[PDB]
Amino acid sequence: AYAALKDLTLSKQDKVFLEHLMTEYGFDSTTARQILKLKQGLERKFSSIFDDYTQEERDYLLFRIIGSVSYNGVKWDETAGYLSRYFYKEVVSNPVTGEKQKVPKSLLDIFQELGLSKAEAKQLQYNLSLQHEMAGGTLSTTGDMVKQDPDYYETAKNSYKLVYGTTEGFDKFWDERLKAYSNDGRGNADFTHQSITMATHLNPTGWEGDTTYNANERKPSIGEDDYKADLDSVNIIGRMKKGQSYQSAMSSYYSDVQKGHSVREKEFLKNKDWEKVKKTIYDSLVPNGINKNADSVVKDYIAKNYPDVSKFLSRLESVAG
Ligand SMILES: [Ca+2]
Ligand SMILES: [Ca+2]
Ligand SMILES: [Ca+2]
């Protein structure tokens, strides 16, 4: 655990970054180092010294690629941007003409272009999806899965063998990852959710989608994993806009979160007006028959019908004063 990061052969800044990935989301050193490998591939592919790209574009690409594990399809391409603009293979499309066409690269092929081996790419994708599904603390140990949903258990087991090549150790692995990714059931930030939120905010062309009736999703849904992801997206993007890279801003932010008190909520309320947040959620969730000025009535309505959004409001209200 501690023993893994002594030798390495990473800058002090990179080790700090790896440790934040591990602490905040639950990744072990193996997965965290694979995420660092992706980032290093982006710097080799999109230079600011030998080419034209910027650090913010490289940070966007990292968020966009990690997000695509869980958020894909044309609805997300229009929203967070098309990865095919940056990752493709060209093939002769008409043998007589010589005309070529650019064929979009799959997510696993993007991972390998950026430096991961085929096995590393499969492991990274799997662990990013696991963290995404487990972060909210709604999933079960294999021991409870067997009894409750035996078909989900054998499905999950098959996915693990697909990745690692064996069924051996699935129960121990799943239970170990469930404790780490879910923060022992209490909730960690949903990393792919945070990533696609940040990618969307950095696309040249979050909490609001999760707290309102937007079309696409399951209505409002803001479990603890999305609460942290949504607020941390806004906070870290804000630090980046002030001049920091993603690695610097997230390192400074998670350090500050540890050193302070309710820093996640206080910093969110400095980026987003508490009254605008309240108003956005009220207009979307509260029917016109309820006087929105009668704040005690509204809070009891939300508390009864949207317990997750209620906690979201209670936590911010608490720090708004
Ligand atoms: Ca989530
Ligand atoms: Ca402000
Ligand atoms: Ca209801």
Numbering used by the authors: 212 to 416, 435 to 550
Please give me the paper's original passages concerning this structure.
Analogous to characteristic antimicrobial polymorphic toxins of Gram-negative bacteria, the LXG proteins consist of a conserved N-terminal domain (LXG), a middle domain of variable length, and a C-terminal variable toxin domain. We show here that LXG proteins transit the Esx secretion system of Streptococcus intermedius (Si) and function as antibacterial toxins that mediate contact-dependent interspecies antagonism. The genome of SiB196 encodes two additional LXG proteins, which we named TelA and TelC. We discovered that TelC, a protein lacking characterized homologs, adopts a previously unobserved fold and catalyzes degradation of the cell wall precursor molecule lipid II.
To gain further insight into TelC function, we determined the crystal structure of TelCtox to 2.0 Å resolution. The structure of TelCtox represents a new fold; it is comprised of distinct and largely α-helical N- and C-terminal lobes. The single β element of TelCtox is a hairpin that protrudes from the N-terminal lobe. Although TelCtox does not share significant similarity to previously determined structures, we located its putative active site within a shallow groove that separates the N- and C-terminal lobes. This region contains a calcium ion bound to several residues that comprise the conserved aspartate-rich motif. The substrates may be inaccessible or TelC could be inactive in the cytoplasm. It is worth noting that TelC contains a calcium ion bound at the interface of its N- and C-terminal lobes. Analysis of the reaction products showed that TelCtox cleaves lipid II – severing the molecule at the phosphoester linkage to undecaprenyl. Our experiments showed that TelCtox is capable of hydrolyzing cleaved undecaprenyl derivatives but displays a strict requirement for the pyrophosphate group, indicating the potential for TelC to simultaneously disrupt two critical Gram-positive cell wall polymers. S. aureus cells expressing extracellularly-targeted TelCtox exhibited significantly reduced viability, and when examined microscopically, displayed a cessation of cell growth followed by lysis that was not observed in control cells. Consistent with its ability to inhibit a conserved step in peptidoglycan biosynthesis, TelC exhibited toxicity towards diverse Gram-positive species including Si, S. aureus and E. faecalis.
